[PDB]
Structure formats: C-alpha cells, structure tokens
Amino acid sequence: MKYKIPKNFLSGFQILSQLDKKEIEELAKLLGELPVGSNVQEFQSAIQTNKELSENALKSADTIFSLGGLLLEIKADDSLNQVAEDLTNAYAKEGEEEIGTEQREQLIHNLLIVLQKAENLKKTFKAYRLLFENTRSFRKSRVMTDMRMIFDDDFQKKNQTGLIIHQLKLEYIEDNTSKEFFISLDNDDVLKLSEELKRSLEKEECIKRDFDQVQFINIK
Amino acid sequence: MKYKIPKNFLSGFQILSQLDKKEIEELAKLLGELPVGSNVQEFQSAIQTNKELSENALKSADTIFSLGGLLLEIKADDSLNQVAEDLTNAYAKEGEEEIGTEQREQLIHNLLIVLQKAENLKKTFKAYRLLFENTRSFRKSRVMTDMRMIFDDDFQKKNQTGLIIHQLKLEYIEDNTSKEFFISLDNDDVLKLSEELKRSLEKEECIKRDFDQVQFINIK
Amino acid sequence: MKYKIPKNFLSGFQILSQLDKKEIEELAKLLGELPVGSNVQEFQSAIQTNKELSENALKSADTIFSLGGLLLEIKADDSLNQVAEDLTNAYAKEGEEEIGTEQREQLIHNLLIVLQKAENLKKTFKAYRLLFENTRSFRKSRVMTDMRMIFDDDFQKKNQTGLIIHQLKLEYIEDNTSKEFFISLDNDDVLKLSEELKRSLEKEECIKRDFDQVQFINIK
Amino acid sequence: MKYKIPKNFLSGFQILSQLDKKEIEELAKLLGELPVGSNVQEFQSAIQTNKELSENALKSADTIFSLGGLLLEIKADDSLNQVAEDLTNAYAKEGEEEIGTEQREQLIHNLLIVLQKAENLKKTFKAYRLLFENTRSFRKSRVMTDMRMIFDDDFQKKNQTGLIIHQLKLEYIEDNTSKEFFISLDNDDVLKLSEELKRSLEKEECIKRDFDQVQFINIK
Amino acid sequence: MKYKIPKNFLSGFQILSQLDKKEIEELAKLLGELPVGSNVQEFQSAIQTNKELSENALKSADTIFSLGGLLLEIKADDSLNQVAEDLTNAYAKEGEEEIGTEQREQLIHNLLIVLQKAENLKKTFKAYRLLFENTRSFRKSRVMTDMRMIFDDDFQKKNQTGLIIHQLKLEYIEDNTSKEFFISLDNDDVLKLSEELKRSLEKEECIKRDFDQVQFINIK
Amino acid sequence: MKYKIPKNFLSGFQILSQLDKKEIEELAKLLGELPVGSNVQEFQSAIQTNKELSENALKSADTIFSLGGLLLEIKADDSLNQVAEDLTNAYAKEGEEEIGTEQREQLIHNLLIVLQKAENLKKTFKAYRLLFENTRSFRKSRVMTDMRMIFDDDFQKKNQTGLIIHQLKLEYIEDNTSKEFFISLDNDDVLKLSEELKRSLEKEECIKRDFDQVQFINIK
Amino acid sequence: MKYKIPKNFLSGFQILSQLDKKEIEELAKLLGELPVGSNVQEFQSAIQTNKELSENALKSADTIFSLGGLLLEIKADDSLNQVAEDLTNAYAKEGEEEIGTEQREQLIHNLLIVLQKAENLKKTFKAYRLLFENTRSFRKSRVMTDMRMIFDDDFQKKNQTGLIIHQLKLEYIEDNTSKEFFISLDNDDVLKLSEELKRSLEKEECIKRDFDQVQFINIK
Amino acid sequence: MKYKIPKNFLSGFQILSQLDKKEIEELAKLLGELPVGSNVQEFQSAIQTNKELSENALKSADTIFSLGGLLLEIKADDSLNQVAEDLTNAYAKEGEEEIGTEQREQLIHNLLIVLQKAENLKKTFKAYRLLFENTRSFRKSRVMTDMRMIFDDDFQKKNQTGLIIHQLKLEYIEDNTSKEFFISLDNDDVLKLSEELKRSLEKEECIKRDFDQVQFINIK
C-alpha cells in the first residue's frame, strides 16, 4: 500500500498460508447471516460460538474484521481486483516479503473470496464510520457537587447559608483529539434536562413504532 | 455618583418627597421577616400582599429592591453615611436637580433608615451576585432530531437504513455575552446522562437530609 | 411583551380597528390553500393577486406574515389564549396605549381567529427557522484571477512564464454575524469541484424520484 | 549544513562514488530540453524513458530532483561555489564521514556541473514554491446529504415534509498544518457556483487565447 | 481638525472670548513651577488654591489640561504655529463657527502663549502616555474563598475534610478593551507572592537611595 | 489493563514474590493511623521511620502509593475483585509474563488485602486529584524591575526622570500543558495586592477558628 | 435602493434640479482627459482649477466621485439603465420624496449621461477597491526605545551595562477593523531591513524601466 | 539533576578526568579579560587563538560555555556548593556512572573553580536570556512582488494597467514556536518605513554619544 502495515494487519498476511476453502465459505455464509452491525467483540463472540470451524482461522478473523474496514474503506468506483493487485504490489514493495505467484495467488484468491461476501460487512463499516463523521462527538461525562459558604463582613457571625452548585464535565472529540468543557447549573435546570430527555425517549418509541420496513441499528 | 442614573433609579430620587416614617419602618420589619433570598417579583408579591401600607410607596419599593443591589454592591469597608454623602454629592453634580438641605436631609435620612435594615437584603443580593461569579453560566437548551438516510453506489436500490442523531444546543454566558454550543449524541449516552442526573438528585436529597442548622437557598 | 414592539409590528396593533370577519376568514382559507413554504414577498404576491379582499387589509397582512413568525416562534406547550393574554398585558404595560375591553377583545378575537389557521404558516416558519439553525451558513461568493509573473536573477531577460491562480471568497454566518474566508486553487481542482457538484445534482434527482408521498421544499 | 541530512539526501552523498561525466552532461542537456515544470514523478518518467544512461545513475537522480530544491532554495546572491564549500564543510562536520580532498573534489565538481545546468530546474522549483506561498491553500473536499424530517406537536400525524441540505468540507493549510471547514447550502446556490465556475473556465480560455509569447504552467 | 470636537473641547473655543494676558502668563509661570506630573484633578487643586486668578479662567483651565494632551499629542517635528493654523482651518471648516481674523487672532495668540510654556506639561503628558504604551496593563483585582467538601461513596458518613481554595481575578487592558483572567492558588503560594513583593519593595528603596540627580515620578 | 505498564509500576508486579502477611497488615494499620493526606515523599518518610518492617518491602511501598492512585482512580461502582480480575487478565495479555494460578493468587490476594485498607488512601488521592480538577492552576511566579529613561527632543540635555515598572510572570496549566502570562504594575497596586492578601489570610484564620469538627487539609 | 441613502449621497438627489447640459458634458470630457486614478481630493483640485464651469455644480461633483464608486461598484453584467430604474424605484420607495416623471427623467437622463463617461472613473474605482481586497493591509507604524538596566545580586555595585531594544508597532486591518502588533529587534536586524528595502526599491526602478506600454499607478 | 543530561553535556562529565589546574585558572583569567557578551562561536575563536593551552581542554570548553548557561541559569539565592552537591547527587542517581569520592571531588573542585570566575560569564548569559524574555521576537523576513492585471468587461481590449504590490513576511516566536505573518503595502509606505528607520538609527547614534560610563552590548 501507500500505508505501512504493522503486525496488527500483517499478521493475516503471514498467517494466510494454511486456511482452507470450506471454512472460509462457511464463515462468509454465517456473516451474511450475522446480524449486520456487529462490533469486533461481537464478531469474536460469533467466532467463539463456532462448532464447524477450526481454531486456527481465529488468528486473522478478528483481524479480518479490522481488515474489513481497511478493505471496506476502499473506494467503491475502483475495481475490486485491480485495487487488490495495486495494494498487493505496493505492500510487496514495502512489505516483509517479496511475493511470488504462489503467495500472491493465495492472497488474491482469498481476497476475492472475501469481497464477494462483504455486503453485510460493507454496510456495517459504512455505518460505523458515519456516526462519527460530524464536527464533534461524545464519550462521557460526570457531575460534581459544591457546598460553598457565605462570609459576612462580620466574621464573628455563624454562617448559616447553604448552596448546591452542580457541575458538568463532557468528553468530546474534534479532529481526532479529546478535550473538556465545563458549565454551571442549579436544581430546576436539572429537572428540566431530565424531563426533556425522557420525552425525547418517548419520541424514539413513537418513531420505532411507525416504521416496520426498517430495522434500526443500535451500534456504539 | 460616577455612574449616570436614568429614571429606572432616578424615579425614587424624584418620588421620595412624600413617603412617611411608619410605613418605611414597618416595611423594614417585614423585610427582616421576609424569607431572605427573594427576587424582585417576589418582593412585588410581598408588596401587593400588603394591607397596612399605602399604594404610593410602591412606586419605589420595587426600585428600592433594585436600588438595594446598587446600595448593597457598595463596598463594606467604606462608611455607610460617608458613602451616602459622596454619592449624593456626585449625583447632585450630574443629577436632575441641585440638592438643598431639605431634599438632601430627606434622602440621607431615608437612606440610613434603609441601610439599618439591609441585613436580609444584603445577604440576598450577595447571594444573587455570587452564583454568576464564575467563568461561565447557564440559561437554556433544546434538542433536535434527524433521520439521515444512506445512499448506495446503486441509486436504484430501496434505501432501508435508519438512524437517530440527537442534537443539543446550550445557552451560556461569558463576559456578560451570550453564545452557542453544539454537540452530537446517541441513545445510550442519553440514558446515561439521565441516570447520572437522577443519582445526582439523590445526592442533593442526602445532603439536604444531613444539615439541619443551615437552610439552603433556592434562587434562580 | 418582554420585548419592545416598534411600528414594524405595532402597525398592526394600530390598524386592527376596522378589519372585518369575512375577509379574515377567507384569507385564512386561502392561506390553508396557499402552498406551504412561501416567503413574505410570495405572500405579497398572493395578496396582490386578490379579487375578493379589500385593499385596507394589506396594511398588516404582510406584517401578519412577519408577526406570524413572532406568533409561531411562540412555545407550543404554552396555551395559545393564555399566551395571548400575557403578551397583550405586557404590551399594554409598555405599549403605545392602555387597552380597554374593546380593543383587547378585538385583538384577542382576531388573534384566536389567526392561530386557528396557522397550521400551514406554523409549518412554514418552522421550516424557515431550521435551515439556519446550525453552526454556520451561506450567502454568496465570487472568484478572482491573477497573472503573477516570474522574475529572474537576471532582470534583463524576457519574462515568459505564466500562471493562473484562481481565488475564492465565501460569505458565511456565525452568531448572527458575517465574515470572510479565502483560499487558493488551480484548474484541475476547479474541474473536480464542478464534476462532483454535477453528480451531487444527479443524486438529488434520484432522491426526488424515489419518494412520492413527500413534497420537498424549495425555500431560500 | 546547519540542517541534518538523513539518507533521503545522504544517499547521494554516499552513492556519488561511481557516476561518470558523459552521463551527467547528457542528463543536464536532456533536463535543459525537459519541459520546465515537471514533478519528481515526471522526472522519474523521463529517467525511465532513457536509453543512453546507465541504471546506476537513477539511485540519486530522483533525489537530485529533491536535492535540486535544496540546491535551488539556496540564496541567489551567495556565490554558488562558496556556498557549496560552506555546506560541504558543515556536512563533513556533522556528516557520516570526514571528507578528504578526493571525495570533496568529486562532490564539488559534480555540484558545479549541476548548478551550471539548473536554469530550467531553478525555474521549476521557484514555480513550485510560489503557488503555496500565501496565507492558505487547498487539497480536497467532499459533499454530503441530509433528509431531515419535520416533527409536529401532534406526533400521531404522518410526517410528509422533505428537505435537501447539502454540506461541504474543504481541506486547507495554514502554517504547514491541516484543518477543516464546514458550511451549509441549497440547490440554487449549487447551480450558481456551477455556472460561475464554468464562466471562469471560459475566462481562462480567453486569456490562454490572448498571450502567445508566454507558455502557461500546469503544475499541481 | 480631521477629528470632531465636542463641547468637552469646544467649550474652550467658545469661552476664549474674555480671558486676559496677566492671568494666563501667571498661570504659565505657576505651571512651570507646578510639580511636573500632575493629574487633571491635581491641576484642579492647583487652580482652586489660587488667589490672584479670576474664577472665570477655570471654565477652560481644566479643559486646557485635557487640551494640553491633544495639544501635546501633536507631532514635534511639525511647526507649532503652522500646525495651529492647519487645525484652526480644519476646525473652522467643521466647527461651530466660521472664524474671522478677530477670533482667529485671539485663538492663535493664546495658543502660542500656551505652547511657549508647555515644557512641564509636555513632559507630564508624555509620561502619562508611555506607562500604558505596552501590550497590556492593569486596573484591579480581588480574591474569593471556597470551602469545597468531599463526598464519599458512602453518603451516610460524616464528611469531615476541609479545604481552602483562594481565587484571583485581575482586570487588564488590550487594544483599549477590558477583560478578565482567573487562576487557582493555595496558602504557600500566597505567602510566596507576599514575600517576593515585599523584597521587590526593598529593591525600589535601594534604587531610590542610589540616584539623587533624578526625581522619580509617582503617577497613577 | 488497556494501559501499558512500565517498570515504574511493573516493578511491584515483579517484586511481589516474597512479601509476607504480618508486614503488609501492619503497614495497613499504620496507614490507617497515618495522617490522611500525605504525599509520596511523606510516605517515604513514614516508611523510613519504620522499625518493625523489613527493608525489602520498600521496593514497592513507594510505588504502592503511586499504584494506589491507579488503584484509587478506579471506578467505585465497579466491583473491586472483578476489576482486579479484569485488569490482571489484560495485564497478563500484554504484560511481561503469562500468569498462572500461583502468581495470580498472590497478586489478587495482596490486592484485596490492600483495597480493604484504602479508606485513608482513597480519601487522600481523591483529595489530590480534585484541587487540580479545574480549568487552570498554578505553579510559580517572579517579578522583575525596569529603570526606563526619558529622551528629549533635545538630546543634549541631562535626562533626570526616573521610573519603576514592576513586572509579573505567572506559571499556569491548561490541558496538562504549561504557559506564561505577563502584566504591568506600579507601587500602589503592589501595596494593594499585599494588603488584600493579608486580609484574606485573616479570613482563613477566622474560618479555621469556626469549625472544630473538620480538620482542614494542607496538601501541595 | 436596498441601502439607505443619507445626505452624504442624497445631497445630489436634492441638488440635481438646476445643473445643465454643457457643464456636465464638458466635465465628462475633462474627466476622460483627467489622469485616471485620482482621489476625491484630486478631483476637488481639478474642480477648483476650473474656469468654464459654474460654482453650483461643485455641490455634487465631489459627491459624484463618491457616488461614482457606488455607481461603479454596480454589477457590470446588469443593464445600466435597468439598474438605474431599479435603484430609482427602491430609493423613491424609501427616499425623501416620491418621484414623478419630471425628477425621474432628470435623474435618469443625468445618470445615463454619467455612465456613458465612467470608463476612466470605472477603472479608477476598480483600482481603488482592489489594493485593499486581500486578507489584511496597512496604515502606519512607529518605533520606540528602551534603556533597560541590569541588576546584580550585589545591589551596592555600580550598574554599568547598557542596551538598545528597538520596538515596532504596526497598524493593520482585517474585516474592516483595526488592530495592533508588536515585536522586538536589535541593531543588525535594523540595518538588514533597511538594506533589503533599498534593494527592493531598486527592483521597482528596474521594472519601471522595462515596460513602456503600461503606465503604473501611484494611488494611496 | 531533575533533568536528563545527554552527551551534549555529559561529554564534560566524561572528559573531566585529565584537565589540570594551570590551564583552567589561566582560562578563567582570560575569560575575565574576555569581552563580556561573547557567543559560543566567539568563545571558540578565543580558544583557537590560544597558545598556552593544550588542545585537549577544548573538548569541553565550548560545552562549558553551554554548561555555563546551565550553570548560570542556576538560582542565585541558592548556595553554589550546595547546589553543586545536589545536582551531582541527582546526576549520579540518573547518570552514566555512580560517583565515588574521587570523581566527585574532581567534579566539585573544578566546579567551584569555575563559579569563582563566572562574573563575566554570568553577566553574558543573563544578557543572552533577557533579550528574548518578552512576549514575542524576531528572526527574519523577505518581500515579494506582484504585477496583477486588470480585466475589462470587454475581454477583447488591450489591458494596459499596471500595479506594484509589495508583500512582507516576518518570522517571529511565541512560546518557543515559530509562525508567519503577512501584510500588504505600497511605494509611499515603503519610503516611510525607510526614512523612519534611518532616523531611528540616528537616535541610537545620539544615545551612544551621550553615555560614556556604559559600554553597550551588541549581541545577536
């Protein structure tokens, strides 16, 4: 490729020397049957739930899931086999080994075996990419609590005033980088967020109720 | 003053020519009895709930509440009567009228009558100032909803993929100015905010339970 | 209101003293029939195309369109008549006239006559608001042209090198304020933008082709 | 030099031990004949299209193209041979080898052989530098598509309103760093950009038509 | 002038119709004797401490102090009388009155009478300008106090941990505009600032001790 | 873990092979008795002040203090033993050694022995985290001194004007990064800061006087 | 227009009621003869140098120069007479007077009389606009001087070290707004700027020498 | 130290094993005689101009100059020998070798031999630090040239208008980082900068003329 491949992806390149045909075609069938929209760990669950497949195929299947995104980040208008040939040539140029017709044939044969089945996986990784493809996004947050006190011009007095200052901390991404953001509240606004969000939840319930022809994704 | 006084505050300066002693002292007593931490509209409610006071005093009482903050934003270490004299002189310098001993005496007499009672009101306006006295604060927010669609490289296909992209818009202040801030979500994170806020609410319940010697303010 | 009303909106308040019932109900009927999503000038066209209505109603109808947004920016969960009463009271407080039962009744009667018909107009102004309700938006742009020249270390030579440096200037809004933004190009990139935009246009053609149950807005 | 030379440039320093005179002078002749304004890959094409040159010269020729910019970024008012001597001394100071008269002579001889021919290449690299030498520049962009939906206060209704919100994403450089920039559109503005750009293209056609004495560069 | 003169400065232009020679020359003498570096209020004190001068001259003397800066912001290399003539012509162009030889002569005569004495005042206003002539400067600050509390994972426990978080707020100017700046502390750092500043104060004492030939300004 | 552990923390993992029970339980007892809120160096002092403990335990105790924060940064709602198991599994995945039941048992046994005692240490590290958990914080500052001079339009004169321009430099953190900030002063403002800070110090004295039930932390 | 016209431009609208034909055509001839690229004050000089024209025409001629830019900022592709008609209609809509055929005819007749001659003036105002049409531009600058002193750890020593720290202040515009920018120097760099600028000046001399067919503008 | 020492500074630590007393004391004498304010290359010149010193001492003398800054960046109030002991202990902690009394004694003996002579060098490095110790500073700049052309609405015309748009590019530092800054000019402003700078140069000449008791530094 024009990109450098560490063993996180080269592992498959090295391990592709034994895997056979029935197992790969059956896995393609299963993935076509697999509920589209699964995470890498979900694919690990699917693999571990196997009974017809050998344990050796697992060394790359989880990586194939990651390689799928690299395989499915590929441009659609570009020919699949031609792109495979180009990336194989570039990899051999900067790869760990010079490729003869034997390993080249095994690689490209398995590759076309894969892309022929990536409809579900193509859709899954398209879905995964898009949810982030905005200006900024979300990870997590907390809240804190204060009990600030009020000091008189007469320090000898008993201070007997109390407060509740909620705080909020959100975790959000821009340009593939993390940041912080802080803000101040009070009780009423808290209730108001809460009620508003609950009613939003009802709205999703209604939209879920409406469309039957579309199954809605729940990906993280 | 060094500050210019429009009729929002000069109205009292002009209207102070008739109000008598019993009404002002009784109002001071009531305010001392008034639950510390009331807003201007709450003071309007207290005034309208009156039965011993004349209607004429109302022309400034609501303004006295606003003048109280101007009266209670005053520096504590500075002598009350001396500060009154200085501000009266500066106002007469740039005010609507040159002050003789008559109006000056009425003004300063009523002033000392007021500051002698501003303990509750001093505390109230101190409280009001502080909650904002941070780097930034809060007014309001909304949410929206999208139903983005997914387009294939084969436009002739039925598009059958659906999404739910919540949006958030917060209203927050810096340097006495307003702004906006926008962000992206998904269902799980919504539930997570909701649960976290509910548990925060429980925390306030516990802290409320603990301290009996302090009555906690609920000011907006 | 809490907002001050100049004659851009007070004009209706002043002019509401003569308009009758048949004309207003017929205009409501027409607006219900009016293609939802029309601009103020489109409403002016609709008005000028009238034959059953008097010319006098025009003094506010165009303003009603603007007042509609102020009438339709109103919060939905708040009762229509109660909100009308509150805004009428606040306006009378700071308005040009104190309102008796006569003008108050005429105003509120016409108001409820209007809000009873604002479904199309509510939808229109919701639509108008939303397209802008993002982080930033668009007005206009240009391009320029340069013919920079290349100077040798030998100034006595004939300079015979030529260039074409397109420039771009976009007009965009943040926080209700305008700005500028500038950038550099070359021929290929120009062709590339052009082709990409044309293919986008085809995409809209396809989506337009798909959905028959939804009529898509073309508002500016 | 004062700059450190990795093998991307030191490779020539190491490989200069065999190349002969006829090949270098013929390559200088060819480059003088080479259409001024070629990229490194274009120079690679020119090299691979060779028939009189040995394959060994290629190890640095492509680097000479890159070294040319380092050789042609050099200040013009500074003497060529004196600058060569200074940079050779500094490199020997921090280089991979201490230079005797033999390698020093080979290096400086080849250097003066090169700079004697860099008129075309000097012009080319001047041209390459300048197009970027502004406040900010360009790489690429995309567009997206939305199909936002409109929700009533009556959720039980069929939502039948549709929209088309194009989006734009430009890739631009400041201070040798990349960024993003986002914006909102609608159909008309799209057509308007398109027509405006087409007419700009016509303008280049006219200017191309006018000047015959100047051949205009098309460099990327 | 090219600048517009309101009555803050036009007042002198209007009031210059009566003042005589002995008073102005004696005031020039006094100002030459006046301790260089006085503020406008200090000049007011000097004026009010007068016994030989008429009260009428005061209407502009305080403004002359302000006009002095406008008179001493003037460029030094430009001829004093020529600059006076130019500014008088421009003012008459956009002033409240067209100037004949009479008022023109009175104005310019008094002007040259003034600039002939502005050595002390020139130095004073130069001094005043410079202290601000940096990137940013100072007005004021405060501190606050917190008593944050520590909440356990076991809310039923008595919270018995205490803190002291000083805060700081500085007031500083850039581009003739004000801002804020906030920061966090603890006790040790407070002591450290305090000791460091005290030792700085000693340093000024030493430098004050050293130079006898220079009297150091204390201007605000 | 999901985080990589260098020998700053892996040292304990490697050294945990000999430490016994009485020493660890006695150290837990001591730490419970240790004044909550001690720094790593304070824990080193506590360790070196030992007489019942072996010297070998010291190899990790100081690291346990650092590991405590990593152990006490852990989420409270997550089960202690389950989190220990998860982190042990992940570490064994990317650790220096694959863990059998022997080292796993020793590790987890000691771990539960520790977390059973971390109340004081949990509170300490919570305290340590929080003081920084704001928008920005403090390290240090200096001051400088100038003796700027005043130059006349007559350079032949003796310059005899003197000044004192204090400067300030603060060291403050945002986003775990350092910066600078500079500002200008004069004598009065210096005195004013000094007096204000002294009076703040008195305020802490008063608050210290008030609450007896809470011991206030002095951590750096 | 869509823009509001104050008397800075409405003055011509009001004063156009007397001017005749010979004077306007002769002024058009003169302007065609006028050296293209003159400022408003240069046009004032040209007017005052008149002998065939009446003094009354001057009331707008200087404004015509300003109106020319408003007349020449007009879009070229739009028909001149049609644009005149549109702007006249809009002005009459929001102007000081409703226009009959008489004043409308006088206005439009004079307008077409003007635009028929604006070739020189069109070029002039195009030129004026462009020089600013970049990201930022220039007004002015200064320099200052320091004589900082060096303080020992032994304050009793004679300080005998001296420095020269030039400073620079530039005045530059972005988005039609002014700013500042500051920087630090030393003697050598000063000489270097000076020499570099002088050699640049020589470069302009050479380019001036080269092209005879083009007269270069010197506009401010 | 708390800082890590690479061989740029550890080289002296390793090479200090042979240097003798007479050479170091004579070099201290020479440096005391050396014109205070010399750069590292100036010290190299001084060293190479030696005749009494051995060549071996040169391996660190140039580094001593750099180590001097590290030796003279040291805090003045801290005891020299105590600081030496602390830094030696910390270095031995993280250094290349554990230090016995022999190398420790040689190191500390030479160290005290050095600091006893660093008055000139202390002053030099203080001077070096300060000139940069502002908000931002300077390296270099250029200028460019344009010959923009003016295009008519009638493209068939001969374009015969010419311009001269100087450009400026400055190189300046903030927070130890580099940047750019760009700006637009014209001929007059160029002359104006030039004249202003020349007159500034005269000002330095005058100040140089005035003070004889202070020798002014010229450091780069």
Numbering used by the authors:
A (entry chain D), B (entry chain C), C (entry chain A), D (entry chain B), E (entry chain E), F (entry chain F), ...: 1 to 220
Reproduce text from the manuscript describing this model.
The ten eukaryotic COMMD proteins are core components of the Commander complex, with central roles in endosomal membrane trafficking and signalling. We find that while CCDC22, CCDC93, DENND10, VPS26C and VPS35L are restricted to the eukaryotic lineage, ancestral COMMD proteins are present in both Bacteria and Archaea.
As an example, MBK5214510 shows evidence for the presence of dimeric, tetrameric, hexameric, octameric and decameric species. In parallel to the crystallographic studies, we also determined the structure of MBK5214510 by cryo-EM and single particle analysis (**[Fig fig4]; [Fig figs6]; [Table tbls2]**). Within the 2D classes there were clear examples of top views of both octameric and decameric ring structures. Filtering of these two different classes allowed us to resolve the octameric and decameric structures at ∼4.2 Å and ∼4.8 Å resolution respectively (**[Fig fig4]; [Fig figs6]**). The octameric particles resembled the octameric ring we observed in the crystal structure, while the decameric particles were assembled in the same way as the octameric rings, but were composed of five identical homodimers rather than four. (**B)** and **(C)** Cryo-EM structures of MBK5214510 octamers and decamers. These different oligomeric species are present in the same purified sample, indicating a degree of structural plasticity in the stoichiometry of the ring-shaped assemblies. In both cases a star shaped structure is observed with C-terminal COMM domains forming a central platform and the HN domains lying peripherally on each side. The modelling, biophysical data (**[Fig fig3]; Fig. S4**) and cryo-EM data (**[Fig fig4]**) thus supports the idea that the bacterial COMMD-like proteins have a capacity to form closed ring structures with some plasticity as to the number of dimeric building blocks that are incorporated.
